Amino acid sequence: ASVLWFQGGACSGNTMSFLNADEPNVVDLIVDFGLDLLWHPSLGLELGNNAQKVFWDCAKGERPLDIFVFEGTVIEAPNGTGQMDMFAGRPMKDWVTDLAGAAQIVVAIGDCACFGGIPAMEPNPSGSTGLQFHKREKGGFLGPDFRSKMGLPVINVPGCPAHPDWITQILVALATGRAGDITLDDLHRPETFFKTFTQTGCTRVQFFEYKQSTLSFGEGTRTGCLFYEFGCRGPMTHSPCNRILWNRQSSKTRAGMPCLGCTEPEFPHFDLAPGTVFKTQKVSGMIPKEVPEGTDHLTYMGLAAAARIAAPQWSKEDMFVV
Amino acid sequence: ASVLWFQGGACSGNTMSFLNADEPNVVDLIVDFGLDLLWHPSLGLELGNNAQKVFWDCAKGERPLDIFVFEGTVIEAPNGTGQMDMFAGRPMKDWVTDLAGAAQIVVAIGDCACFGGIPAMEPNPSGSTGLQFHKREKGGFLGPDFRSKMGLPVINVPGCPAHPDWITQILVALATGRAGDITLDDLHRPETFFKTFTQTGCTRVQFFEYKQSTLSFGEGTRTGCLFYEFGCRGPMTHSPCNRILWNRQSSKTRAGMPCLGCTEPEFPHFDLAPGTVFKTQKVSGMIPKEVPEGTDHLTYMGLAAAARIAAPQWSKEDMFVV
Amino acid sequence: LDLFVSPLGRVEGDLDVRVTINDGVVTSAWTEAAMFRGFEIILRGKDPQAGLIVCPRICGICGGSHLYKSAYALDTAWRTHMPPNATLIRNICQACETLQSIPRYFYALFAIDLTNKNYAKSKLYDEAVRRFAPYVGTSYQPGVVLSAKPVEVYAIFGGQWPXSSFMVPGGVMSAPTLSDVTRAIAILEHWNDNWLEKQWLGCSVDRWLENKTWNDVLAWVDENESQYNSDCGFFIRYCLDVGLDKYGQGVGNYLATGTYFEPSLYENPTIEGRNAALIGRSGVFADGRYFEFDQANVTEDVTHSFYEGNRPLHPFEGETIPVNPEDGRRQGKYSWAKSPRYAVPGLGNVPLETGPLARRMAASAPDAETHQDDDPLFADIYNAIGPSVMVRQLARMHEGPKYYKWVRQWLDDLELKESFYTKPVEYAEGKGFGSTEAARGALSDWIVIEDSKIKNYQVVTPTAWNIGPRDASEVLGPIEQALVGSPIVDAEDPVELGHVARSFDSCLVCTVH
Amino acid sequence: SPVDGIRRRLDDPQVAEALNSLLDHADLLAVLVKGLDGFVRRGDDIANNLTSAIGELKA
Ligand code: FCO
Ligand code: F3S
Ligand code: F3S
Ligand code: F3S
Ligand code: F3S
Ligand code: F3S
Ligand code: F3S
Ligand SMILES: [Mg+2]
Ligand code: 3NI
C-alpha cells in the first residue's frame, strides 16, 4: 500500500506525533506492515526533481497511490492562487487536487488538514482550509462530495496534533484487511477513536461528577476537574486522549492542562479570543456557557448542585499527590 | 542497594507483573539503578547451599540487606509451625522473621504478602497472613509495631498482583534518593499510587456519573459502568489502575471487567461467597449495599436518581465501539 | 551420595530435590513440592465463578491458562454458548501468555544455567556467558524484556496481565475495538520480529516451521550464519556440545490435554466434544503409541503426597485434605504435589510427562483434522534422539513460531461486529471439565457445582503431572525419572538437576496450588 | 443481664400496651415498607418516567 504524505500549512506536529508511534512504531509501520511510504517531506530521501518525479507519477496515475496523507492546511492565499504554499513547483493546493483525485484513500491528519485548524483562525492570512471541512462546515478544499477511489470521503484524523495511534492504527487496519472495520463519524473521524470524549478516562471525572473544580495550576491540579475554571473542553470533545494516552504516559487533562477541544473542528475554539484561554466562560459567574455534550444547562446545573451537596470529602482534597 | 526477594504463599504473579516492568524495565532496574538483586526464587542463579549461604548471610547480618521484598503469604500452618511453606531448610515464616529483622526496608508486594490475600480466604488452610496485616487488621505476621531498620513499617504494595510500577517506581525512588518522597497511607501503601481510586481514570466514570449500567459482558461492555450490575469496586478501591494502565494498555474496568478491589486488604471481598462474584449486592434490588467511598446511601441514591434523570443520550449508548 | 538440594529455584515456587548419586549419576530422585496454599480447599462453598478469580492466582506466569480452563470448566458445567469471537479471544490470550512464558522462562529461568562453570571447557562457553548470563546476558536482556509484549496483547483483551478474570462462562467480559485488534497485531508482529525471528530464530517463523525432522533442524542450524548464531541455533549447538541431549529423558510418555478450540467446533462447550474441537490437539503418547486423551482416565494419587487418601481419585471425586508434613514424612510422603496418573490400557495408571514436548508428540498423531496442529517434527525427533533436556526445550521453543502464527491468524479471524459473550444460565448444579495447555502442559479443572456453590474444585496442573511424587506403585513421576540418569559433575552446584527440572519449565506454585 | 432488662421493660404495662398497639398496626407498617420496597424496585422506572416528562417539557 503506497503512501504519499504531503504537508501544506503544517507545523509537522502530526508527523512528529506519528513518529512517536508505538505498537506499531513508525519504522515497523513503514517497513513491516506493507505500507510503502513513497515520500514524506520530513522523511523522504528524494529531493528536487527525483521527489517531483515521485509526486507527478502519483498525480498522473503512472504509479498507484493507495493512501494520500495530507497534513497542514490547504493554503489558498493569495487570491485563491495558493502561492503562500508553493511545493515542488506548484501551489500545494494543486498537488492536493491531483493527489486526492488519484489516491485510493485520502487521510487528513491533524486539524489543519481536517478542518483548517490554527492557520484558519481569523484573519486566516494564508486562506487556509481543510481538505473536506472548513471548521465544522463540510466541504473544505475538496468539496463536500469528494470521494477517494475506494469511495471514502477524506478520513479526518483530527487533533493538533493527532495522536500517533489515531493514524497508525487506521493504517494497520488498512494494512491488515480491516478497512471495513473503520467507521467514520459525521466529521469523517474514525469512530474507534472519536466516539469517546477526552473526558472518557480522564483522571478528574470523579471531581467533575462531584463538581469539584481545580482552582489553580501547578499543585492546584493535584485535585479537581479543569472544566469549571480552566475551560476544559473534555466533556464536549470527542477523542480517546484519556483512553489511549499521549506518549503512552498522560494526557493534557491528566497533567492538569485543560483539553482545548483540538479534535473538534472549531479548534481553536472561540479563536482564542481574549478571556477564552484556560478559562471557563460563565453566565452570571456560575453557569458555564457550554455544558457537556448532550446535556442542557438546567439539568446540568441541577445535577451539579445535587453533586456539590452530596460531594464526598476525598473529592475535595488532593488526589494526585506526590 | 541489595534486594532479597522471597516468596511465601505466592503464585509469583507479583514477580511476573514486576517482570512486565517498563520505564524502568526489570533488567534496567536490576542492573542500571544500583539495586543488587541478591536472590529471587524466580530469577536467582544460586540454588541449594549457595542460595542458602546468601540467605543466611542476609539473615545474620554478614552482608547488608537493604530491601527485603516478600511476595506471597506468610504461611503459618500447620499449628503455627509454618511447615506448609518450607524454604531452604526452614519454615518460610522463620526466614521472614530473620530477614525482615535484617532489612533496611521491608516491602510486601501483592495482597498475599500485604494482607494475606487469596490464601487467607476462609478456611485459610495454610494459616496464611500478611507481613504486617491480616486483611484490614494491622499486625499480620510481624506485628503492628514492626519497623525496618530505616524506621519504616512494611511498605505494602498491594494488588493481586501488584502492577510493576507500584514496586518499580518505589524502587527507583529509593535508588534515586527520593525515599523521603514516599508517603504511606494507613495501610502502608504508597500514596503516590493509592490516593486515587481504580475509578480514577476509568473510561466508564461518565457512565457512572449518569448511573448508566453495563448490562452484560462482551459487547455489553461497549457502554456503561460496571458498578451497578457487576460489582465493580472501582469507587471503593484505592489504586492507580486507570491512571497507570496495566501492561501499558488497559485496566480491568476499561476492558469491561469489574474491579475486584484487589488493592484493598479485604480482597477477595466477601471471600467470593456465592452471589458476590461479578455481581453488585443490592438492597431491595436497586440500592447497592456498598456505595462509593465517602458517600452515604441517602445522598448517593438521591444524586443517582438526579443523574439518571439528567443523563445525556450518549451515556445510554455504546461508546467503546469497534 | 544422598544430595538434598534446597532450594532449587527458578521453578516458580518452592522445590527441593533429593537425589541418590552413584558414580556421578543420579540413580533415584524425589521431587519435594514444599509450599501449600490449598486453593481447592478455599474454593469449596464459594461462588461457582470464584474459580475465575482464584485459579489465576494459582500462578503468576500461567494464571491466564488457569483462567482459560476455569472458564471452560464453567462453560461445560453450565452448558454455555461460546461465540466464536470469545473462543478466538480466549485462544489468543492463552497463546499470548504462552508466548510470554517461552522467552521469559527460557532466558530468566533456564538458560542462565548454561553459564554454569561445569561448561567452562566448552568452546561455546564464552558465548553462552555473553548471551545468557543473568541480567546482563546479551540474549537474556532483550529476551526477558520483550517477553512482556505478548501479555500486553493479553492485557488489551483482558484488562491486565497477570490477574485478569475476563474469561467467563458464555465468552469474555471484554469487547475488543478495532484499535485493540490492530494494536494487538502490531505488538505481536513487533515481538515476533524483534525477539522470535531476529533473536531466537535468526530466520522467519515460516522457515523454522519448515523443519519436519531432526535432520531438518540440524540443517537449519548449519544453513546460514543467522540461524547458526541465533539463540535457537546457538542453544542447539550448545546442547549438543555440553551434553544436554544426553540426559533428562524422563518417562518418554506424554499427556497433552490440548487447547485452542476451533471457534465453530466449540460454540457449545461439552466434555465429550472437547477433543475434536481442539486446534492444539490433545493426545496421550504412551509406549510409543498414540491414545485419545480422556479426562475420565485421570487419577490423583496422594500416597507420597502430604494429603490424606488411600486410593487414586478421579478429580471429580478429588479431595485435598492436607496432612502435617512431619506426620506425612513419617509415612513416606515427601511432597505437596499430588501424583497425577493416567490410565493407559495395557499399562495401568502411568505417569505422563506434560508440556510442550507432550503437545508436539500429540501434534504428531495421525488423523489430524484440518483445524488441528499436524506436525511430525517431534515424532521424528523422539524417534531419532529421544527425549532429553535439549529436546524438551526445543519443543517449548518450537511452540513459539507455531503459536505466533496461530495468534496472528486468530486476530485476523476476529469479527469485531459479532458477539463476544452469550449470557449463560448460572445453573445451581453442574459438572464442568475445563482443560488447556498452559505453557508447561496439561492444565485441567474438574468442578462440581451444587446448590449454586462450588461443591468440588480439583485442579491438576502440568507440573503436578511432571513433578508429582511416586504413586502407590512407587513409580517415579516424570521429572523424578528424568532426574534419574542425570550426571552430577559438582554436588555443590548440581546444575544438572536444575537443567532437568527447569527443562520441564516446572512451576511449583501450580504444582501444589 | 441487659437482655433481661429489655424483657423486664416488656413486662411494663405501658410498654406492653404500646408494643401491642404497634403489633395491631403492624399490617400498615408492613404495607408501607412493602410500598417502599416496591417504589425502590421500580425506582428506575420512575426515573425513566421523570426523564420522559422532563424530555417533553424540553421539546
Ligand atoms: N504453564 C503452567 Fe502452570 C504449571 N504447571 C499451569 O497450568
Ligand atoms: S500539530 Fe501542526 S500540522 Fe496543524 S493540526 Fe496542529 S498546527
Ligand atoms: S473530568 Fe477531565 S476531561 Fe476536563 S472536564 Fe474535567 S479535567
Ligand atoms: S486538546 Fe486535543 S489532544 Fe486530546 S486532550 Fe483535548 S482532544
Ligand atoms: S498475584 Fe499471587 S502472590 Fe498473592 S498477591 Fe495475588 S495471589
Ligand atoms: S466508573 Fe469504572 S472503576 Fe468501576 S464503578 Fe464504573 S467501571
Ligand atoms: S481488582 Fe486490582 S488491579 Fe486494579 S482494577 Fe481493581 S484494584
Ligand atoms: Mg490439584
Ligand atoms: Ni505456573
C-alpha cell recorded at residue D30 = 408492613
Residues C376 and C365: their CA atoms lie apart, in Å, by 8
The H or E element containing residue C155 is helix C148-158
Is C12 known as a binding-site position?
no
Q: Cell numbers 539503578 correspond to what residue?
A: B33
State if residue B252 touches ligand 6 by the CB under 6 angstroms criterion.
Answer: no
The Cα–Cα gap between A182 and A33 comes to: 17
Chains in contact with D via at least 3 Cβ–Cβ pairs below 8 Å: B
Those residues with Cβ within 8 angstroms of residue C57's Cβ, 6 or more apart along the chain or in another chain: B11, B13, B117, B118, B160, C39, C63, C163
D50 to chain B, minimum CA–CA distance in Å? 7
DSSP letter string, C369-424: -TTS----HHHHHHHHT---HHHHHHHHHHHHHHHHHHHHHHHHH--TTS-SB-PP
Q: Which residues in chain A touch residue C154, judged by CB atoms under 8 angstroms apart?
A: none
B114 is in an annotated binding site: no
CA distance B107 to chain A (A): 19
Among candidate residues B141, B126, B117, B118, the one with its CA nearest the CA of residue B78: B126
Q: Cβ A310–B302 below 8 Å, yes or no?
A: yes
The answer to whether A90 touches A41, Cβ cutoff 8 Å, is no
Min Cα separation D22/chain B (Å): 24
Residue of A23, A189, A194, A243 best to disrupt the C interface, most CBs of C under 10 A: A23
* Amino acid symbol at A24: P
Taking CA atoms only, the protein residue closest to ligand 6 atom 6 is B225
- The reply to whether A58 sits in an annotated binding site is no
End-to-end Cα distance, chain D: 67
Closest A-chain CA to B196? A319
Q: How many CB pairs under 8 A join B and C?
A: 312
β pairing state of B2-7 and B36-39: parallel
Q: Which three cell numbers stand for residue A97?
A: 487536487
Sequence length of chain C is: 513
Partners of residue C330 in chain B, C-beta under 8 Å: none
Sign of the alpha-carbon dihedral angle for A86, A91, A95, A97: positive
CA distances, C356 to each of C123, C293, C400 (Å): 29, 16, 10
| Residue C5: its H or E element | strand C2-5
Is there a contact between A264 and A185 (Cβ–Cβ < 8 Å)?
no
Amino acid at A282: K
| Residue B58, annotated as binding a ligand | no
**What residues form DSSP beta bridges with C450?**
C453
Counting ligand 6 atoms within 8 A of each CB, the residue from B200, B205, B263, B315 with the most, and so the one to mutate, is B205
Residue D50 Cα to ligand 6 midpoint, Å, equals: 25
Query: B117 CB under 6 A from ligand 5?
Result: yes
Query: Which chain B residue has the Cα nearest residue D54?
Result: B309
Residue A287 C-alpha cell reads as: 453557569
Q: Say how many Å lie between the first and final Cα of chain C, rounded.
A: 32
Q: What gap in Å lies between CA A169 and CA A188, rounded to an integer?
A: 16
Work out the burial of residue A32: count CB atoms within 10 Å of its CB; fewer than 13 is exposed, 13-18 middle, 19 or more buried. Answer: middle
Chain D residues touching B309 at Cβ < 8 A? 47, 50-51, 54
Residue C348, CA distances (Å) to A159, C286, C309, C479 in order:
68, 11, 19, 19
Count CB neighbours of D32 within 10 A. Answer: 11
CB half-sphere exposure, C123, CA atoms < 13 A: 3
Cis status of the peptide bond prior to A268, with omega within 30 of 0: yes
Residues in chain C closer than 8 A to B253 (CB atoms): 159
**Chain D closest-CA separation from residue B112 CA (Å):** 39
> Which of C89, C109, C156, C163 has the most B C-beta neighbours within 10 Å, making it the best mutation to test the interface with B?
C163
- Ligand at minimal distance from the CA of C458 is 8
Provide the number of CB pairs (under 8 Å) joining chain B to chain D. Answer: 23
Asked if B201's CB is within 8 angstroms of A202's CB, the reply is: yes
Query: C173: CA distance to ligand 5 center in Å?
Result: 22
Q: What is the DSSP string of B75-96?
A: E--STTS-TTBEETTEEHHHHH
Pick from B223, B203, B230, B200: which is nearest to B293 by CA? B200
Residue C190 to residue A176, Cβ atoms within 8 A: no
D50 contact partners, CB below 8 Å, separation of at least 6: B309
* Residue that is written with C-alpha cell 456453590 in the block: C453
Distance from CA of A161 to the nearest CA of C (A): 19
Provide the 8-state DSSP code for C335. Answer: B
D43 touches chain B (CB under 8 A): yes
> What CA–CA distances, in Å, run from C128 to C114, C133, C146?
6, 7, 20
Which amino acid type is present at position A110?
A: G
Q: Which grid coordinates are listed for A22?
A: 508505538
Q: Which of B22, B163, B252 sits opposite C164 (nearest CB)?
A: B252
Chain B residues inside the 8 Å CB shell of D51 = 308-309, 311
Nearest to A94 by CA among A127, A142, A133: A142
- Answer whether D44 sits within 8 Å of B308, measured CB to CB: yes
| Cα separation, C346 vs A124, whole angstroms | 88
A313 touches chain B (CB under 8 A): yes
Q: By alpha-carbon position, which residue is closest to atom 6 of ligand 5?
A: B160
- Report CB contact under 8 Å: C178, A25: no
Query: In the structure grid, which three cell numbers stand for residue B275, read together?
Result: 452471589
CB distance B308–D51 less than 8 Å?
Answer: yes
CB-nearest to B321 from A191, A206, A322 is A191
Q: Between chains, do B86 and C52 touch, taking CB under 8 Å as contact?
A: no
Atom of ligand 3 nearest to the CA of A234: 3
User: Is chain D adjacent to chain C, meaning 3+ CB pairs within 8 angstroms?
Assistant: no
Separation of alpha carbons A93 and A319, rounded Å: 49
Residues, chain B: 322
Distance CA C315, CA C118 (A): 42
Buried b (16+ CB within 10 A) or exposed e, C21-60: beeeebebbbbbbbbbbbbbbbbbbbbbbbbbbbbbbbbb
Distance, CA of C376 to CA of B312 (rounded, Å): 60
Q: Considering only CA atoms, which residue is closest to atom 2 of ligand 7?
A: B262
Mutate to test the interface with B, among A199, A244, A291, A314 (most CBs of B within 10 A): A314
**Is C412 within 8 Å of A169 when comparing Cβ atoms?**
no
Is residue A196 within 8 Å of A203, Cβ to Cβ?
no
The answer, yes or no, to whether C and A have at least 3 beta-carbon pairs within 8 Å is: yes
Interchain CB distance below 8 Å, C178 and A176: no
Among protein residues, the one whose CA lies closest to atom 7 of ligand 5: C57
SS (H, E, C) C255-295: EECCEEECHHHCCCCCCCCHHHHEEECCEEEECCEEECCCH
Distance between CA atoms of residues C320 and B297, nearest Å: 42
Distance CA A131, CA A71 (A): 9
Give CA–CA dist C162/C152, Å, rounded. 10
Distance, CA of C96 to CA of B200 (rounded, Å)? 28
Q: Give phi and psi for C74, each to the nearest 5.
A: -70, -40
